[model samples]
Every structure is written in C-alpha cells, then in structure tokens.
Target: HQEVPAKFNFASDVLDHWADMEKAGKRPPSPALWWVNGKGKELMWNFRELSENSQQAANVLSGACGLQRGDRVAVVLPRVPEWWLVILGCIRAGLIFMPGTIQMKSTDILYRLQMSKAKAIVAGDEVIQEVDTVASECPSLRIKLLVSEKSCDGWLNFKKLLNEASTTHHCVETGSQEASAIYFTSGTSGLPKMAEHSYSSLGLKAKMDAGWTGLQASDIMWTISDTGWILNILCSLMEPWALGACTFVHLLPKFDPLVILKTLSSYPIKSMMGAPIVYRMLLQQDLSSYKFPHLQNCVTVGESLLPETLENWRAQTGLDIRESYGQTETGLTCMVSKTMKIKPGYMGTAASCYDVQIIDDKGNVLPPGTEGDIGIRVKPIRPIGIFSGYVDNPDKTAANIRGDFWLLGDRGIKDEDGYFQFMGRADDIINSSGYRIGPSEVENALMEHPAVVETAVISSPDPVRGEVVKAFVVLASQFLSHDPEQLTKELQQHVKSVTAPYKYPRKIEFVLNLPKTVTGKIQRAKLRDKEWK
Candidate 1:
C-alpha cells in the first residue's frame, strides 16, 4: 500500500515529481492533458508545462483573487482546461474547494454559497450570472473569478489574471489530515450536506484505483462524468495524473452517443470509465462502424444498468465492462479489479485498504447472502479515501457510525464468492442518470406549489434512467377541479423554478391521499415498491 506523508501538497509533491522526471530526462515529455472539444479544438500540455501553468493559476487564486488559505471557493465551470488549472490551483493554495455542476439554478447556487459560506466563486460566463444574482446574499463571498472569453464588470477575468501571474510562487504547505474539498451530497432527508474530505483522502485515491485498471504513464485515460462529481476528481484527475498518464476530456454540450463513439474511434484512449446509462444508450444504436483499436479498460460505476448490458458491451468491444461501487464520501471503496474474475451483476471485492462488509443495524457482521447495511471497518484504521464527516453535523456523523463501523446508506448483500451485490438504497434517494437526487429536495420544491396540499417523492424504476423521481400528490380542495393535465405541467414548472430543474419529477400521479406510516410520515417504501414490484 502506498503511504501519504504527514506533510503533502499534491502540486508540489506529486505533480513536481513528474516535472523533475521530465527535466532530468528520467521520463519522456509525454502529454499530460488533452482537453478536446471534438471539433478540431484541442490543446495538449506536457508534465512540466502543466506544472508551471497550474502553478500560475495558484498565483491568480492566492494573489490577485485575495482568497487565502482555508478560504472556501465555489467552483462552477464546464469541462474546460481552466477547470483543471483552477482545481489544481485551489489545492496548491490550500483553498477548500467546493465544486458543483454548471446546471445548478440560481436558487441551488444561493443555497450552496450560503451553506458553505464560500468566500469566492470561480465560474464560467455561462454560470457567473446566476452567481451574481445571489452574490449579495452570501456575506462570506467576496471574490468572483470568471472563466470566459470576455471580461465582466464584477468578476475577475481568469484568463487575464492567469497569464499575468508568476509561476515561481511556492505551493502552500498543508497537513495530510487538513480539510481540502467539500462535496455537496444528497441524502434521504433535508438539504444536501457538505461532505468534507481531507488532503490525505485525495492523495490516497492516487494509486488506490491503479490496481483496478492497471493504467500506465504511456496510457491515455478518459472518464465521462460531470466536472463537479467526485468521479471526475477520482478517475479523471487523481487516478490518471498520479500515474503520470495522459487525461482526455471531451466538451460535448449534449451527450450524443454517436459523437462519443466517433470520438472514441478517433482518440488513442487506452482506458475509459463512464456511467452505465451511456453504455445502455450506446447499445441501442447500431455500433457496426464504431471501433476502438487502443481501448482496453472499460469500467462502469455500480448497477445502474442490467447485466445483459455488460455482456452486450463485451460481445461488441471484446472487453468486459467492469463494475465498481462508491459514494460521494468515499472513493474507490469497492472495485472489480482488472486481475479479479468478472461477475456481471456484482461490484467485485472490497477495494485495496478498504474493508467493506455487510453488517446489521447494530454493526453485527452478517452471513453471506443476507442483505444488510454496507459498512467499512473504522476501529482499526479508517480507509484512506473516506471523508472525515458531514461538515458541522456531528449528530448526523455519529448516527452513521456505530460499533466501530461506518455504515454507508446503501443496503446490499455479500455473496459466498466474496463479491458484493447491490440491492437498493437504504435511503429514499433517486439516482437517475448518474445524478444522486434527494427525495426531500424534490418534496420541498413540490410543496411550494399552490395546488398541492401534500406530496411524497420517491424513486420509480425507469428503463432509461434506471430510476426517476415520481411524485404522489394530494391536491387542495379548491384546486381539485383544476385540469389534472395542466396542473401536472404547472407543478413541473414550479419545482423547476424552485430547485434544480433535473430534480423535477418526470411522472406525476394525482392522488386523493398518500400512504402514511403510523406516526404520520410518508410511507415511501410502499410507494417505491408500488412502482418497482
């Protein structure tokens, strides 16, 4: 197992190691990053070049931006090269990075900014306006850095500042256990929690995933996910850069399967990880002309797709589509490694240094085949990539950890063969199209509607997205005469206006009453089973 030192800064320690190798002629000056837009617009940077460029970005963040160490910065950008530079710069400057999708509405952006109390927000022109709308409300927010072609009035121009910043700035020294990044994660109830992870957690993910894919420096790896997601940091950045391999990112405004196949056929990508929904969508099209001469590793996260999809990919690509499981709080917790035997339905054995297990509510180890709470051993040694806890939520943290075991909010079973099979989420989370959506978030937005008297949101199985948000609504007496068809569309608009548009329910069932538990709580299990069963 690789060890992380007590004092570690990824920029100076990990990145500079490869830079020195290039300078001393110990390794070839191979391209470290390939930011491609699939329209002949691409830029490639080698290790030393990337090192200096990111160092300059750090200067822009710490110098002109005036965001010092420990200050939180909300990162909102698309899959651009500046995203890479800004993230690395944040880490180098010891800034607590809070990343989110560009799809975040102004309301969602405001909540994130106020909750995290972010001092700065680095966003693109596309999303900066949304940030500006709520910037005055965020008392902690002071700096607004815009990553766009044109300059803005209040925002610092990222391109202008980065070019002027010096590359000779020293990387800030940081502790291994020091806080690094905050990921807003969905839960069953309440708003999203700021899941804080340490620098060691990021450092530990470096080689942790290498055992799964067996990637090398000469390899060109690609991961298809949002820039805000933890998977981007885990696979797109940490996994590839730590191994001195090249990373490839495609800027597709929309996820078109044919374009992805065309790009796959064009690039020299050796290894790639993507969501299962993409693979499912790709399988529908006639893949008669698609080819990947250099592609070797094909990995997908968890079981968002059927086992037949995995078999279908192997039949077409002549490579197995391996399954791995992880959450926002942990990285690479369980992987169907490259060396391990394939189990189409199972998300393989426990990841290296991650003692994953099936335990009961009291933290008792369950026998194989018994579906129970998925947990990791923490009494002996906490896993490297696991987050410290939910920020400022000690009771919530204590509730998840019991009897020296940190329970993941998922319920699954361990087979006799030692492979883990995912059943479903213990929490009422709707994971639709790689998005972890909270039921409460949707319910809260829906409750704001004028027509609805009461509402319940839960996961409904869908062929396309694996699961989609389904809302069971009870209309008020006055609105009962309103058109059910028109009200459905009206409610959709209201939820979209109140929250992130994606969280809006695709299916709305107008009901007289919703199933409730004894204590007057919504019986979400009954509703979910109604759809699934």
Candidate 2:
C-alpha cells in the first residue's frame, strides 16, 4: 500500500515537507507537539516552530560539537521537549540516534556506548552523572553535551550552544537504505541486542502505524510510555506527524492513576495508547468521576489485554480498547483497525502490509488450529517496517532470520476467523512431564479471581516431572492481611477449574511485587533462575 522513494531523508522528506506547506499557507492550523508537566509547565510547537528549532539544534551539533554525518550519538533524557529537538536534529544531520532511558545506570550506559561506539551523548541533568561515570571507559565517546545549563566539568552546555547557533541549515542527503538509528531491546530474558534500522524503515513506521491507529489531521493522540522505547516514539512522535496530527506528551515523575485520569479529562485527547499495565492500573481507580467527551480510540500494546480488564474498561468508558502484537525487531505486524470487530483475548488479524504466518520449528507453515512460532514470510520483498539486523552481532541476527522467513520467537496460533491467538514466548513455555503449558493462559485465568491483583506462572524444577508450574502472586490491598496458604489453595483450584488441571500451578508464593525491567515487562527468568539454583 506504500512505496518509498529511492533516495529519501526524513528531515527533507517529512519535516521539510510540512514546513514548506506551512510556508505556503497550505498546512493545517494544528500544533505538531504538546507537552505538559506536573509543575504546571506547558509547551506547544507547531510545524514551522519545530522545524526551525530542529535546524538550530542541527547547527549546534555540527558547529559547536564537531559532529559529522554517519556519526552515532546516544540520547538519554526523560519526557522533555529537548528530547524532540535532539532526535529531529540527528535525523536532519544524517547521524544515527540511539535513545537510552532515564532508568539506565552506569553499567547499562557503558554497555550501549561500547557496543555502538557512539561519538557523542546528549543527556539531562538527572542522568548526566551516570554518563560521566563511564565517560572515560568509552574511548570512542568524544563529545558530551548536558541538557541543563548547570554544566559539569567536562560537558558542554546544550542550551548555550542552541541559543548561539543559526536557525538556517540544510538537511543532509541520507538515502532510503542509509542507517538512521539503532534501538536496543529490553533485556528481560538476557542481555539486550541493538536492532539496526534504515531511513526508509523508520520513516515507514508512521505510515503503517497511522493505518493501525486510524490517525488523522484533526486527531489529538497521546501515548503513555517512556521516550527510551519504540512504542512511545512510534505513536507519540512518528505516527502523529506522519498524519499531520497533534501529539500530547505528559511528564509524570512516576505512574499515577489519578494523574492520568485528570489529564484525560482535562485535555481534548482523541486517541490514547498504552501498555496493558497502564490500563490495569487505571482500572484500580474510579473512572466514573472522569469525563472523556472527546476520547474516541484506545489501543493497547506490549502484551495482550486480559478479557476482564478489557470488559471493565468498556463498561466504565464507552470505548473498546484494541490490542496489537509486535516485537522490537519487527515493527507492528498485526493490529485491530477501527473497522474490525473487537475480539477479547485474541490479537487481531495481520495487517495487510505484512506476510505474517504461524510456523513450526523447521520453518514450515502450520495450519489454523495449530500453535507454533509466528513468522513473517520474506520471499518476494522484505516489508518496509522490519529491522535490518542486529548491530555487531551477525550470529544472533542470523539466528532470528532464516532463508525465506523471519522467526519472531513468539508462540501463537491462527484461528479460522483470521485472528492470531497468542500463547506465550517460546522460551517462557513450561514443559511438565510431557505436556507443554503456556503461562499466559494460566496467568489470565488466575487474574479473573476476585482477590488476585497480578500473577506470574513459571516452570519450577521437580525430580520426577522435570518441571512443574509455580505461581508468584500479588494480592489486592484489601486481601493483603488474609492468610496466604488458604488464598494460594483457592487460586490453584480456581485456575484448575478454568483451564486444564495439569496446567494449574502446583506451588504458589505470595509477594508484594514482581521484578520488572525498566520497560515494565516481568523478569520471569529472574524468578526461574532463583528457583533452579
């Protein structure tokens, strides 16, 4: 449905296109970006304003920092306006931009710097100390620019350079196939790998995601996520601008359900997207107080939304929360469009732009009712949104992509209705005696109980059965003082009645919270590793 030019630069192709339209008085009168914080700080930038500011930032990088085309720069910041300037500036200058989260410590930053060999780093005051802690170790890291005016001993002031730089600059000619950026995966299972993407791949994301989200110029979309991950960038920045829509960015110091409710009620937000955790937390609050007259579309990603959560959300608000499935390596491959029927647990059909299929281990396609790895057929031409490969790790990259198919490393089955039913991650599957069990089905069943707040099911070692299902649970606040043994037995029986008896957890542990990565994915391997030891 979409075709890219042979030579394309995002700055020249997309940003400048909007800028020129504004200059000719043909652009819509909509702000490109909108930001609000808890401290009553609000900022708005239109197309021309964003374009000129990015040009000035580009000049500063090239003149003051001595950065050149093809150079790699790492950006570490929170949900601030300056983050936008840095990302757009790098695209205009033909530099590879790598985004790091504020949650990263010195060790994580060092790993990314050493692996990517980045030349410069732009960090905020909160994380500048972590970058400086490992600055000496990163030999290739030449320039350090702090986002704050309170400069450290060895860092340049980003604000000072931006104020002194010119607002007129030309975009470099980075072809469609040229490298644009590298995104690192969340290392919940193991060490993260850097996934490389081209200008075309990154540029096409907005187009494809726009289709999935049903974005338009009049829509004001908001995505609740950190800037470090791909989901926020795709929905908040790329997809909105691609459709000439306005994007809302709220800076919450931490996740608060009341704050999110207030924002949704105050702003004229049309579409909202977030992870399942965000929605689950919102369910904990009383939604009857909030009024969302303008809110129309709601989307969920990162994981499947439980049926109870989805139904409760719909009952509270007159909207259907759609679910989409994708990974870091492959951009959004399957999603529920605006016109599609809203299935509760099943991830919707594959997007028409991709060739997604359920396949066996030997790379053969499976039938509709069977479960296997979800793969993308790569025979004719690779899709536009797929990643190029893993950076500096050819062996790991080859392990994922085969001759005619790219294995997504996820387990799922296709239904006769064309919807994809997600099982669990291939690595997360539990083998007990001879039967294979998916933890998701069990987790979903356990969550339906009244007292269960959240749960994780993993394989626990056993002498005769090789492994058995073990559940770590977090109970609701009201039931925290209840007896654990009785609650555990009740939960086990609940799961057994809901699903196959053999798939129920034989052992249960009560805990306050589960170990999670910065991206909010539970670290099942951490629990499994401790139990196995």
Q: Which candidate comes out best when scored by TM-score? A: 1
Query: lDDT of model 1 at residue 407?
Result: 83
Ten-residue segment with the worst summed lDDT in candidate 2?
Answer: 429-438
lDDT of 2 by residue, 149-175 (tens): 587789899988898988898888887
Task: Tell me the lDDT of candidate 2.
Answer: 0.80
> lDDT of each model, Cα atoms only?
0.85, 0.80
- Report the lDDT tens digits of candidate 1 across residue range 273-338: 888988888888777788887888888883454788888898887888888888888777787788
Local error of candidate 1 at residue 294 (angstroms)? 1.8
CA lDDT, candidate 2, residue 464: 33
Show how many residue pairs clash in every candidate, following the order shown. Answer: 0, 0
The C-alpha local distance difference test score for the whole of candidate 1 amounts to 0.85
Which residue pairs collide in model 2, if any?
none
